[PDB]
Design an enzyme around this catalytic site. Structure first.
Site: not given
Ligand SMILES: [Mn+2]
Ligand SMILES: [Mn+2]
Ligand SMILES: [Cl-]
Ligand SMILES: [Cl-]
Lengths: 26, 295
Positions: B59, B61, B87, B90-91, B119-120, B168, B216, B243
């Site tokens: 990731d 991010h 990923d 995001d963040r 998943n992002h 992922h 999750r 992930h």
């Molecule tokens: Mn992630």
């Molecule tokens: Mn993820």
């Protein structure tokens, strides 16, 4: 020289498994 | 039409510059990256079959300067071959620079640089966790929708030299044959359940026997015996996934049958984790390069 289209996964000796890179954060 | 070298040069020229300095491409440049990478994603298989050598990253991010450090230490394309596990957005504070550099390198080196879906890379997630807000602030809503159409075409898994299975999230109770992955049609959203969901959302768990409920609230956990049976059935040696943040940047599971990679050090400024990438040489000798702020 593309890589998009019998071997075996193996690992180095313990002292050669990780190579570290340190950086200064701001 | 696409001034691809100019884009890459402007993305790379902030290396070492004023901390956190943005690279603000034009919206036409970004739309061009999305449109041309989308073509390439759809022309290549959804289950990438790759040969070694390559470096595999987890990731990011939106931690753009950590992505630049990954390339600095691992080798800038095309000096090294790369597979990213998803990923990208995001963040972090610089999702746009991060994804634009990755898409530019995908267009520039299409058979030596690869990006999987995390998943992002999904509008209903990244509307919430930062990417939409970044697009709306720095560009407009139409550009966010252009990204979504591009992400909906990312490939989902890779197999390196018939031995390393990469995705992922992780395994699926609905994954019996690799043909089920190959049969997934694009563009597609990520569903709330099923094979594609699990490949982007599931996690290994040392305490579960078989398949368990994932904390999750999406997908499943799977145990060490699920991993062993999957590898034996498919004549694989290793699952490589991402992930989950892990303290040392990589983390083994089930006696080196699975490894988790996470490439964003000090994730969110909240964790004190390293980032790692895994180098795979031509003989499938695997090792880790670990990136950590000095302390
Ligand atoms: Mn992630
Ligand atoms: Mn993820
Ligand atoms: Cl390489
Ligand atoms: Cl199990």
């Amino acid at each position: 020289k593309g890589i998009l289209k019998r071997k075996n996964v193996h690992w180095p000796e313990e002292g050669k498994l990780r190579e570290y890179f340190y950086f200064e954060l701001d | 039409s696409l001034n691809l070298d100019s884009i890459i040069g402007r993305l790379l020229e902030v290396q070492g510059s004023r901390p956190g300095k943005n690279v603000q491409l034009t919206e036409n440049e970004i739309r061009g990256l999305c449109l041309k990478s989308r073509e390439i994603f759809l022309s290549q298989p959804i289950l990438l079959e790759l040969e070694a050598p390559l470096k595999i990253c987890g990731d990011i991010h939106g931690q753009y300067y950590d992505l630049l450090r990954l390339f600095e230490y691992g080798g800038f394309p095309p000096e090294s071959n790369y597979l990213f596990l998803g990923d990208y957005v995001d963040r972090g504070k610089q999702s746009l620079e991060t994804i634009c550099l990755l898409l530019a390198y995908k267009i520039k080196y299409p058979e030596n640089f690869f990006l999987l879906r995390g998943n992002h890379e999904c509008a209903s997630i990244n509307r919430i966790y930062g990417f939409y807000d970044e697009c709306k602030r720095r560009y407009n809503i139409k550009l966010w929708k252009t990204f979504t159409d591009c992400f909906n075409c990312l490939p989902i898994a890779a197999i390196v030299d018939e031995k390393i299975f990469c995705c992922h999230g992780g395994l699926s109770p609905d994954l019996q044959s690799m043909e089920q992955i190959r049969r997934i049609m694009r563009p597609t959203d990520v569903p709330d359940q099923g094979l594609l969901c699990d490949l982007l959302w599931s996690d290994p768990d040392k305490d579960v026997q078989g398949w368990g409920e994932n904390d999750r609230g999406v997908s499943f956990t799977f145990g060490a015996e699920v991993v062993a049976k999957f590898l034996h059935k498919h004549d694989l040696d290793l699952i490589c996934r991402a992930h989950q943040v892990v303290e040392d940047g990589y983390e083994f599971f089930a006696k080196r049958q699975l490894v988790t990679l996470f490439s964003a050090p000090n994730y969110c400024g909240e964790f004190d984790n390293a980032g790692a990438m895994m180098s795979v040489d031509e003989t499938l000798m695997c090792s880790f390069q670990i990136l950590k702020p000095a302390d």
